[PDB]
Design a protein around this ligand. Sequence first.
Ligand SMILES: CN(C)CCOc1ccc(Oc2ccccc2)cc1
Ligand SMILES: [Yb+3]
Ligand SMILES: [Yb+3]
Ligand SMILES: [Yb+3]
Ligand SMILES: [Yb+3]
Ligand SMILES: [Zn+2]
Length: 608
Amino acid sequence: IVDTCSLASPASVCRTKHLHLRCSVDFTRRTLTGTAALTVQSQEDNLRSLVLDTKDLTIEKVVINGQEVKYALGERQSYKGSPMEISLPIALSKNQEIVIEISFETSPKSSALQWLTPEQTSGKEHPYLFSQCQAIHCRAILPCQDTPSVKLTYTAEVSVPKELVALMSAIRDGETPDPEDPSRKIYKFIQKVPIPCYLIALVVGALESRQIGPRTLVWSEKEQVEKSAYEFSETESMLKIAEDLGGPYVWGQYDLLVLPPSFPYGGMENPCLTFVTPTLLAGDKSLSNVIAHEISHSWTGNLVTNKTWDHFWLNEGHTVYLERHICGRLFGEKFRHFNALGGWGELQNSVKTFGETHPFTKLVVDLTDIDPDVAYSSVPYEKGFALLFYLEQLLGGPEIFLGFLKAYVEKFSYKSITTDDWKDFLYSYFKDKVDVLNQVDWNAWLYSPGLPPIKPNYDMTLTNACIALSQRWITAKEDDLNSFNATDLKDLSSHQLNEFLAQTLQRAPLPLGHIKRMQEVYNFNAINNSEIRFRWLRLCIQSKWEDAIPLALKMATEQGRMKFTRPLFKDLAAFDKSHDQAVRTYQEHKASMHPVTAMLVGKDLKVD
Ligand SMILES: CN(C)CCOc1ccc(Oc2ccccc2)cc1
Ligand SMILES: [Yb+3]
Ligand SMILES: [Yb+3]
Ligand SMILES: [Yb+3]
Ligand SMILES: [Yb+3]
Ligand SMILES: [Zn+2]
């Protein structure tokens, strides 16, 4: 099967087995410079050339067997970058391995990287760099077969200014002063478990660590360590549950890195070092499902991997499925159902926003000539989850379906698979239930746009109070507003508060007087919980409350998680009173934003 997002030679032609990366980080030039040594195994007879992905890389030379070889860069193909063809000096037989050492330098404009000035950090004294390779940005750091169909181990040595610390998606393997430059340090890393390259990660900054479990340090700038250690304290208990459900955690360490506010995603499951947004820091551990999610990826995604990005739902549906099982183990089955139902609500929202015929409301997609970053949404997460929850109920319940899950992980560990591999295995595992599986509308579930053909069964117990309060507000007239009071919230958890706001946002706009009264009685402006504040601010802006404009602009820019930043900017652009402010604010912040987020918000706003 073809990876339409990669220009490199496919796995049927050759396979990278190992990367040795030696590089130096230059904050003055905003470049990573060094060598990438790829141990490549031929999958063909008489192999005489191969192609790697690159994007905005400067190649100095390519060395094989101690000598330079011929290579050429093809024309750039937009978001895919430029293909790099390398002429092998000796034809390779099948299964023969060689080492190809490429000397390269990244561009400042690397879409994989954000370079922060001291001013953009917590500490204000030192600059900061972080990577984000998923889906296809690893090629903007180093030449590689940038496709999740290929898995490799890696070792790395990274030279940085001595006042800073480097971390990677790997086990830390020592530091020393840089023997060539006393103003620098060299940090070493080893990743002994084979991984797709999208899992390669690097951060360099003024980082400190705190131990929070037997195999977990939290890393961040000093200003955030204390809050992060508390917020994620349940990590080890989640890892133990995850091991029970998925089998052995094979990666050794499970560290967490809390990035600066411009980190563009809730989390990234980089092996040995999950990256998360500081917008998780609600002060009460209430957004810890994101940690449960990233933990779960150590099985579904990092062990069993999607073969191409068209099959991304395999990564996300199964991970959300495991995530909600971890939460259910910790807080009860009724809570698992509460979050499952909330996820269905997010899928409804996506389908409504995209449109019920939109190609990216399909579960299995076709990314031919589409930038994965433009396609990305919560659909593969929630439509994928819905399919699995539906199957769980069809096939005899969670205990039975968890047996399939563990078997599936065992079966495909260290491999990259397609939707058919998954469905073939489902049928084999549940062969005594084929008659039931054969009545599943597979083509609709997998390939039709819109809401899925069947909605699962959800327990309503923790949801009822959220809907009831939302409905009171929606059905209230002016002469009913007096009856609302802070006592309304006294028995709602933060999770239920968030769901009340989600329910209400689905019916937005509300009358302006309603939203004013809400603030007057509940003081939602004072809540720092990022998920709650996000929905609250969207509700205010869509209901045309001008007072909320500065609050929404501030949330949109003072952090950069796209889940929040993109919709806030879009709501602000849609509101006539804030439109010009939204565009100008974007234009003022554009140069200092994450490159991917800057591109997407700019497209969202039609700024060019
Ligand atoms: C979430 N991660 C931490 C950052 C974004 O990572 C991506 C993962 C997959 C991707 O490609 C798609 C998008 C939609 C449907 C199918 C495939 C695009 C981006
Ligand atoms: Yb041959
Ligand atoms: Yb400044
Ligand atoms: Yb098949
Ligand atoms: Yb009335
Ligand atoms: Zn995920």
